[PDB]
Design a protein around this ligand. Structure first.
Ligand code: GSH
Length: 92
């Protein structure tokens, strides 16, 4: 399983919706609540240059926010990013 992390705040509808989407995918993931934690939020802001929640990561790859991960899903490429099963056809 990949290391999936989402940074959230408890008043934010968009972080709640992103968590919901991730739950809907059947993956395990770590939620880091930064509602009350300036240091943790600043550390992540330094990493991405983004100053909002949610921020979603898969093994150090930053996928963005609520809008971004929903766009990835419409594009059909969120599953792959999250570590869901890949199928390959082998031909001789
Ligand atoms: N369109 C963004 C919206 C993100 C956003 O506006 N987050 C707000 C809270 S609801 C925020 O991080 N405000 C700064 C803060 O709450 O500290 C997304 O898709 O993630």
């Amino acid at each position: 399983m990949k290391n999936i992390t989402i940074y959230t705040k408890n008043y934010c509808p968009y972080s709640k919706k992103a968590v919901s989407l991730l739950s809907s995918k059947g993956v395990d993931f770590k939620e880091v609540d930064v509602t009350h934690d300036s240091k943790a939020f600043e550390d992540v802001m330094a990493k991405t240059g983004w100053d909002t929640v949610p921020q979603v990561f898969v093994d150090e790859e930053f996928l963005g926010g609520c809008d971004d991960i929903h766009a990835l899903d419409r594009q059909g490429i969120l599953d792959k990013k999250l570590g869901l099963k890949l199928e390959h056809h082998h031909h001789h």
